[model samples]
Target: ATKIDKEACRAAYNLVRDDGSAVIWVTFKYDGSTIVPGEQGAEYQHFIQQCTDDVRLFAFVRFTTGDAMSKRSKFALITWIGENVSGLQRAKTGTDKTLVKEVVQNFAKEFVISDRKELEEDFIKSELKKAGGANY
Candidate 1:
């Protein structure tokens, strides 16, 4: 019995896609029985601050593809499983994650992160870079 804030979810995705070069990251968190929107910012560092093990959250991370001259937007779906979160919900992550798709249906990559290292912006962009067919 979990529900996501569809308004919060679509608003973030639409805006990020709206301004290909204007947005960066947005997050969704489980506030009790509902997965409401968490944070949205142009900086990845701001995204990182919300991932501590105290609570579980989801993220839609965005970065650019193509070269500096011409770029395209790319988004990642982060199944952010908090390390210290209770095992009961952690198990529910898999099931409810599918429900998340009802709102967020696109992503170039999928990352299930529980630690700070996995949350690195540089590391994440690099991975997305490869997914975007990086020649570098």
Candidate 2:
């Protein structure tokens, strides 16, 4: 299981590779009670930067808000596209349908958060299904 300090925001970052190419997705999971001023997104850029060595980065963000009771909002997901990332151009120009599936699958397998191996399997499947790909 992915374990870190529960009191402090947890950071999980990894290089996701398919064949020889890769991209990076950095996730921060924080408890709502601990959020202070600018305690979330760009403010935590340094922490994500510390996880990688690349000086230049191209990235996008995704976020999840907590339900009413817990109000536990997840940190904005930062995805860094490496300079050498393959198939990015093809996917953008609509030249390659496979590119979309390939990229989504690459990220899903690495980021699924589950303690059980079986659960992680299910989580990745769910992620791909959300990304317009058939579940495995």
Candidate 3:
């Protein structure tokens, strides 16, 4: 289940409400578990830094691991915000590709399970699936 603070969402919604000139962008990178902000130029850096502690920001998503045939899959979600407004923007060049990848990997390593256990579990599941255990 995803838990969202209605008050926080309301505040964030209000801030962007009726504002057109301001840019609001929400990004998601899958294949890993974590949310990473852009670290490009000053504008990108500033926005990400702010978002790290921005209270008026809200985001949520659902993640699932393993295939549909695997009953041992896991899923999770959340809606959150910081204490300030993080003026985050999109990265629009090829140079930002590396930075974005690094940020995403770091985010996953820091926030998600990045230990050997996770790898071992994934491998175990694969092995079990190959062995013809549908419930594994």
Candidate 4:
């Protein structure tokens, strides 16, 4: 199997070179208690389906690369609680760790809504922001 998809691998490489940051969903345990070092979109659905009680749906990004040796960082990403979850959608909030984490975390908290709807809007807004308007 592919270790990472073509897009993800490229993005990871792009960021990894300059110690830049990119957004991607990592694995989380049920109830969002702890986060693991596993990649999403590969086994996320399978894992979520196995949860019988409650689960935490999360989307986060790497903060910084620590000297290429001591890997330490922080997060201010997601905290979603539910019985069922489809998945998560994410966007690259640039290389600003503090600003990116704060803005996204607060947005998720303040504008809580249906997961699917929120994700849909997230993608739409990302595209619009990229194009700078409708007529792009």
Candidate 5:
């Protein structure tokens, strides 16, 4: 992929990073009393299938707690990742429509606290460092 593709993908990721009403249907089961995860997975899968007719999602990403980490409040992240991929896929112009999407659940989202400005600045520096920057 060119720098344009990278920038486009980044922009695409940002577009749906946190848009509400993003529906998700997960198909895997959660442990007993953890019905929400299973349900959410099923629902997400259903929604995607409804849209794709099982054509095959080109890519998917998930963020969750680490292994041996609590499963609580994690299903929601899975949903968000799925929605983000969908949004990213649709955002690309028609000529770049070949990108495939799929899902990866049960990821960890743990990080030590840091200054907000520092985090933002880090991202800015990284973006600025990109060969194409925002031009793509």
Candidate 6:
């Protein structure tokens, strides 16, 4: 196992904490151990494309949409285990997640989405809202 990429985590934290619809996906390059930033953007599809079926990743997904009554910006942590990954490889993600979290640490919600069917904008927002509380 390698050390986590501090630079990549910092950039990701900055974008997610202060921006809207910021999607930062972190990956272990070449199936290696170091967690580094893969791609990021203010667009949903841009980051969605990076969540392929052959790679494992952790993403900072921020969605900003709420009524005028309160704050709408929401952020979540995703442990993405692509289907192509094996059981043994998948086991490592749990530990590496701790390293990743040490740097990128500000998400209110945590989810593990391994299937493509779970990547919906509205669906994500609803989940965040539910976890966000005070839904009256």
Q: List clash counts for every candidate, in order.
A: 0, 0, 6, 0, 19, 0
TM-score per model over all chains:
0.85, 0.20, 0.21, 0.29, 0.23, 0.83
lDDT of each: 0.77, 0.28, 0.28, 0.32, 0.26, 0.70
Clashes of 2: 0
User: What are the runs in model 2 whose C-alpha is more than 4 Å off?
Assistant: 1-60, 67-92, 106-136
Q: What lDDT score goes with residue 121 in model 1?
A: 68
Candidate 5 has an lDDT of 0.26
Candidates 3 and 5, the one with greater lDDT: 3
* Predicted structure with the largest lDDT when compared to the true one: 1
Q: Can you write out model 5's per-residue Cα lDDT over 3-86, one digit (the tens) per residue? A: 123333333333233334353223222123121122222233343342222121222222222246533222221121223234
Off-target runs (Cα >4 Å) in candidate 4 are 1-23, 31-34, 41-54, 61-76, 83-114, 121-136
How much is the lDDT of residue 90 in candidate 3? 24
**Candidate No. with top TM-score:** 1
lDDT for each residue of candidate 6 in 1-136, tens digit (9 for 90 to 100)? 6577788677766766664433434333333656677767667777667778888788877677777887577777778888998897687777677777777667768777888667788888888877863211
**In candidate 1, where is summed lDDT lowest over 10 consecutive residues?**
127-136
Question: What is the C-alpha local distance difference test score of candidate 4?
Answer: 0.32
Q: Please provide, for model 3 over 54-94, each residue's C-alpha lDDT reduced to its tens digit, 9 standing for 90 to 100.
A: 23221211122465785342211112234343334121212
Worst 10 residues of 4 by lDDT: 89-98
Task: Summarize candidate 2's per-residue lDDT along 1-136 as a digit string, tens digits.
Answer: 1122323222222122211222223333222322111222333334344233222122222222235784421212222332343454323323222222232332222221112232232343445445531222
Per-residue lDDT value at 56 in model 3: 26
Question: Model 5, residue 76: what's the lDDT?
Answer: 21
Model 4 lDDT per residue over 1-136, tens place: 1021334333332332233333333433322322222344323234334223344333433232235676543222333445354443211111222332332332212212234433343443343334321110
